[PDB]
């Protein structure tokens, strides 16, 4: 398979940061409860620990963040016994810079930004799909772990070389993966 160098280095350095600079062990201790999923990490600690790592994460937030999630999962799994079904997420607070709403441009897509605003409306909470599992209606093959991103995406093609089905699938909600969701 093909691997990503930057993702691997970011994983290693973020594991080093979580293990060396410990408040985050104490927060992972709280992370056992079923109502907690997110770890909150101060960004000034990242700046002090490694300027290179901080710059890489800021310039590569979207690409790196899912791998930091896996590193956090491995950390909490090593420290405590938690079922593999649960997921975990990372958060950052103390950014030293601000950007106005109109200053947001297409060049900043995918990086980490901080803005200010006023709330006007909040929608109710709903569950959402993250990674789905589908069953092919022709050859009965099971396709697992299809990433949804930001739309209801079916598998690109049936994994059976002879079938080549791209239009008829069933969704098995029991095997699927969910996350809470709200719009503001």
């Amino acid at each position: 398979e093909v691997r990503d160098e930057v993702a691997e280095k970011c994983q290693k350095l973020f594991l080093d940061f979580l293990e060396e600079f410990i408040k985050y062990l104490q927060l992972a201790e709280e992370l056992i409860r079923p109502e907690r999923n997110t770890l909150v990490v101060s960004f000034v600690d990242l700046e002090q620990f490694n300027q290179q790592l901080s710059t890489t994460i800021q310039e590569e937030f979207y690409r790196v963040y899912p791998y930091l999630c896996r590193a956090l999962k491995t950390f909490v799994k090593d420290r405590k016994e938690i079922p593999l079904a649960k997921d975990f997420y990372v958060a950052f607070q103390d950014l030293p810079t601000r950007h106005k709403i109109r200053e947001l441009t297409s060049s900043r897509i995918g990086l980490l930004t901080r803005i200010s605003g006023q709330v006007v409306r909040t929608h109710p909470v709903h569950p959402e799909l993250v990674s789905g599992t589908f069953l092919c209606l022709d050859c009965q093959t099971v396709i697992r772990d299809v990433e949804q991103q930001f739309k209801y995406t079916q598998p690109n093609i049936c994994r059976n070389p002879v079938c080549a089905n791209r239009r008829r699938f069933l969704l098995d909600t029991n095997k699927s993966r969910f996350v809470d969701f709200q719009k503001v």
């Binding site: 709903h126 569950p127 959402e128 799909l129 949804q148 029991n174 809470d180």
Partner: protein, 220 residues
């Protein structure tokens, strides 16, 4: 009557494993308990085979569960208990149960099919002429059930300042119909459900699911 009431406290005191399994597997356990209650009752009296062929079991008391705000992904397909205020009612509706279908090529009557709450019943083929369809419902020989739909809103006195009350839908069946008036305050024991056709948003927007509560008891 057609309904029986059981307390969770006594059930836990006598048989702990059933009480432990009750919250995380409500439908099948309720079906088994209904079968057991029907067997016991028919042992007590033999005439109900003429009067009532099924008996429902309802849970009365429980450890009080969180309000409408806290219901999230963790509570799906579980047993919950809520308190709220009724705002609307749909009346009484005849839902299908044990459906008989007439073939449209010949006139054979297909046997009874149990109507599950999740998906519609689609018969495969006519057993005699082997046709694939179409089929229609035999109105005269079908059995019907009572169905009602309710919207529940948080009590305005318990809402913290700075946020708004939130609402959820519930469904009442059989003896539970017309047990509440709009504007009243009720408490329900029910099942937090997703697995019903049409819950997934597909036409446009994010993949968002809609949740529905299926109730089995009412406490004023």
């Amino acid at each position: 009557r057609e309904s029986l009431v059981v307390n969770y406290e006594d059930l836990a005191a006598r048989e702990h494993v059933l009480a432990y399994f009750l919250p995380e597997a409500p439908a099948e356990l309720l079906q088994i308990f209904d079968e057991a209650a029907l067997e016991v009752v028919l042992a007590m009296y033999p005439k109900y085979d003429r009067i009532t062929n099924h008996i429902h079991v309802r849970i009365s008391h429980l450890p009080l569960v969180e309000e409408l705000r806290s219901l999230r992904q963790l509570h799906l397909n579980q047993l919950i208990r809520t308190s709220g205020v009724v705002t609307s009612c749909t009346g009484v509706l005849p839902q299908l149960s044990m459906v008989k279908y007439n073939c449209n090529k010949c006139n054979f009557v297909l046997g009874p099919f149990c109507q599950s709450q999740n998906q519609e019943v689609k018969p495969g083929s006519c057993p005699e002429c082997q046709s694939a369809g179409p089929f229609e419902v035999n109105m005269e020989e079908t059995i019907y059930q009572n169905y009602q739909r309710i919207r529940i809103q948080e009590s305005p006195g318990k809402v913290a300042a700075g946020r708004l009350p939130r609402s959820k839908d519930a469904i009442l069946l059989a003896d539970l119909v017309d047990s509440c008036k709009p504007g009243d305050e009720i408490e329900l024991t029910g099942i937090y459900h997703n697995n019903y056709d049409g819950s997934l948003n597909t036409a446009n927007g994010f993949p968002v699911f809609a949740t529905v509560i299926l109730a089995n008891h009412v406490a004023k």
